[PDB]
């Protein structure tokens, strides 16, 4: 029996929910963070200090307060999916925009013009941020940024920069445990394609939300798997060939989905279920390209009249491991046959010399790359399944941060970037009156991240923000030390992609909370 | 133990229920709509901005308030079934008539004469609307209306107008995903008949409430399927011929209904269950016409002594796909044999030259069309299962809007059409006194849609309505821009069929709520 | 633990229950009726406007109020079973007699003399009504009454009068769907006998509370079916001959009853269970007459030594369809052999020439008719399973109304008949004092139907009744128009059978409520 609450009532309750969540996440922000003890049903309390687990763990009771929390959770954690940082920045900015917006609307404003002005200011700030971003291109500044991302370490930074030089920034790098003492890298052959899970229960290792495997044979199709009878002679050669074979054909027609959850969940099957890597004419070429690289053929609809129903283990595919993340898949160590690989590379490099549109050119260049070059596996060693299993996580975080930095440059860390985007954009023209109110709201919640990063350390945040504002254009407060230092000298930076994405998601979700206009909730 | 409430008590409670529903739907009306966050039991909140999902999602608790909501839900959503728009307009008009009617009756009126006067005014307004409707016939204005319906887009408008020119307005157009980049159309052979689901669980794809399939063989009868023993040798050649065969004979005698729900629901059968396309002598001819077009014969009662009990896969039917909507069915790609098709077309075109009544003439001309012409499948491409799967929905909405416009013309959009039907019809003669009260009620709730479309944008609705009323006969307010512009110039239109249908359904359901006269409800 | 309430307490509570029911049914009375929204557990509200469904749907909670409602429900709805109309008139008259009776008894009266006087007045009014009834005999006035019963329609009236002329008023007429456009009639061979259901779960089509079938073979006995072992070799030739054979022998000995509910309910058997058509010596002749007409023989106890235990499909019976209503059964299309039919007709017409008593004469004349003449099936067509399936219901209602009118004539409609029986019968002699009180009660609740039919339309009922009372002897108010018109001219009539039956049932149930004298009810 749905319960329906109109206008400012629903907005007030949703804002209380998001207020609780942002209170509990803004604590663990900055370098001088703070612990937060999230109790666990069975076991010891988890003592964490990062803003993603706190947010995932909070979920209130009142249903108009759980909506406020759930909206920001979804938006911020999808920014986290996009790249790793700023799930806290997004949440705190969203709360600070939504609360001030609700306050101004309660004084008789127009919650369409408020949104219009806020989005005007947000787009202006994104432009100014891209104007102030300092890029990172040369393989030396790449090393410097990798070192800074790895908390001053040099070996991790050196190895990351070395791999980036070896495989090109727009390449593939993966991290694996090393059966040695010190770390090394070894370019191998293989590729990855941007298709992920179809079911969150398909994962193999509950650690890290991933699904890892080992040596396997491949089988692909250009047509959707329409039945489970098409999959009965699929696990047939699975246990009958000592290889957990791989099938990545196309979307499985629902029945196979629940069927395979039944036949792996609590049973433990070892096949794969990933979608098709592209669309249309290029997708068929990519399916046959994976087939030719690994050894087999596409079992769809073709002129050779091949069909997957027959269990043919003949020449499926020589792969290494398959690692299906949430939104990516990686086929490693493909050594089907040497002739076909160089042959297809020749074919692609020939068809490149055809002077076609800037869509087909790039869409075939991607196949060229995926078949010519290869991943750069990063074997990280240690003394220990603690030393290694920790240095792996640290180097993975450093790799993600430096790769996110490479694209859009870097800006001042510590939440001072938006603090520099403030003073440039008092040059906005507000049409209405409430557009100016939206601009004021953004100009007031632009110095929230720096304020909370300072207040977590302990010094009063207003004084620090004012000092930074009246400081130079490169001197920003440093919470780890306690004095205002620099960007180039002190080396505390944030990739621009993270700052921009956090600002965009905060603006979007705060607007959706500032003009709600009945919410409808079920009665408990 | 039924609970019984008499007279104005039941009407008051039902009106409170409809007041809540119309409050929650009138928010999302017009171009400058508003979000509404309908929470979901398992998952994230759904943030919607259209008035159909809100209405379907609301259902109250008090049983005399749930009736008020349920009546308007049913009526408005069947207008939505009839054509796509104005489920919000109907609901808001119905609430505005019912509330004012209850108020006038509470001052000692006669709730039969009130209804009589209201229906007088409604019929007058329908007449005036048809008087002011501007038709769309020439293939250029068709393109203009298609573009306007597709939000200014030209390629979608051009393709819609092109298909309409190719297949004739009173033809068949369908939309399918395109395995390419840009869109195209390809007239194929096939037809559709106006028979739908017999069970809402027969659907295949839960998306869009449809039941799609692929290549199949056909089998039809002129006599009802009286048993399930008649259907035991029906799925026999289903799994034994690799074609999910099609059976559209006549109504299945109940036992087969629940049986097939048991044998597909949680099992997954792939046959069809659609009724007969017509009535009597013509229906037999149509059944045999589908049979001759596809390849087989009608398995009913005839002189050739054929019966469906024998599993004869001999010459059933060469069809393409079958797509059973809620209230329509479409048999595509019929290539049974070339001789029989042209032969039967010759037979029909010969029997046309017989000078019969204007019933048999049209009833045979429909068969002539369904066998001579064919559908115009619209292959829409894109870059992507997001680009395509979105452009498909946009082009489907544009197609429905332009087809609904073709029939009865177009009128001024933005809810100004009824605002133009007001001033013409102060020339009504009310017999009683309460007939004049009904006329006043309609003349006051005729400018509700424009008022709410303006108030959603934000400007006070009374001033806008008054300005429009004292404006010209073609200048209407435009909420997307904010200034009064036009109909021909600005290009904001509403098909007449939608406005008229919304008005009729509002009048009907509001009358039924204005003279309720005990309602009987179960005790919880 | 029974709860026992004595005297005026139980009568007061039962009267409150009947007051609620009559309030809710009296609303939907007359031509200008009123809707009543009876909610349904699963689905949309049912918006009805007839007084039978309202009454069947009401059932209160308090057990001394549910008895008051249940008594009038039973009595009125059995009048409805007898003929179709006046389930509302009976209920309203019963409430108006019982309430006034309770009021007079509460002033110290004698609730035996009250009943005596009331029944005196009721019998007087029945006599006066039969005195004023105008018969309908000639085949032209039959057509006029059929047209009036079909709401002015002429084709329905013409077809009804035509069938009545063809088959004789005391004949058989049935209505079936027509596989054509316009309607027609076709006298066929067959008969019906007055025996119905033995179990309300034996029905086949839940629509209309009937049990319809198709071609079948017959088997009858003169002795009761004493076992289910006698029925094991009965469904044997049921599925083994492709005919759902018919067995109408005699009452089945209980075990077969629950057994056949088990073997059809949720299973779906297709045999029949109807009792014997008569009593004794004539019943045996009728059983063998059905046997000779259809083809077989009676499987009871005889000189030929035949018994049903053997499965003999030899010469059972050539029937058409069997349609078992609640209290009737119809065996259609009997073509066993031509010789035996005319032979038995000759035998009956010979034994007619024997000059016997006026009991055997009629009891054999009925067999003569059932074997010589036949039903007149009425094939009604339409454009459509809506046009037909509605015209069928309209023609069925018209047929029932005209047949009920043929027997006892017709009187003024609109509830003015009793209003004409009032003034004639102030010439009654009351013995006691309370007999005069009963007479006054009837003379005051005789003008209740006209008053409520007027008040439903809207004009104050007292003025209309007084105007009619001081009007002529043929001018009665007309609610559809609004002016006093006529009986012969305006053509608004009610069959006398309905008025008389409604009055009798109202009197009976009101008396039973006016002298209750403890009721005993279970504790919840």
Residue numbers in the entry:
A (entry chain N), B (entry chain M), C (entry chain L): 1 to 524
Sentences from the paper on this structure:
We purified active heptameric mHsp60, and determined a cryo-EM structure of mHsp60 heptamer at 3.4 Å. The map shows that the equatorial domain has the highest resolution (3.3 Å), while the apical domain has the lower resolution range (3.9–4.5 Å). The equatorial domains contribute most of the inter-subunit interactions, accounting for ~ 75% of the total inter-subunit interface and 44 residues involved in inter-subunit interactions. Center on the inter-subunit interface is a four-stranded β-sheet: β1 and β18 from one subunit connected with β2 and β3 from the other subunit. β strands are shorter in mHsp60 than in GroEL: 12 mHsp60 residues compared with 19 GroEL residues are involved in the β-sheet. Specifically, β1 and β18 are shortened to three residues, the minimal length for β-strands, from five and seven residues in GroEL, respectively. Thus, the three mHsp60 unique residues, T35, A516 and V112, diminish the restrains required to form the twisted conformations found in GroEL β2 and β18, leading to shortened β2 and β18 in mHsp60. Thus, the three mHsp60 residues, S57, D59 and E522, contribute to the shortened β1 and β18. Overall, mHsp60 has a much smaller inter-subunit interface than GroEL, ~ 1258 Å2 versus ~ 1674 Å2. Importantly, the unique sequences, T35, S57, D59, V112, A516, and E522, are specific to and conserved within the mitochondrial chaperonins of higher eukaryotes including human. Overall, the inter-subunit interface of the mHsp60 heptamer increases drastically by ~ 49% from 1258 Å2 in the mHsp60 alone structure to 1871 Å2 in the mHsp60-mHsp10 structure.
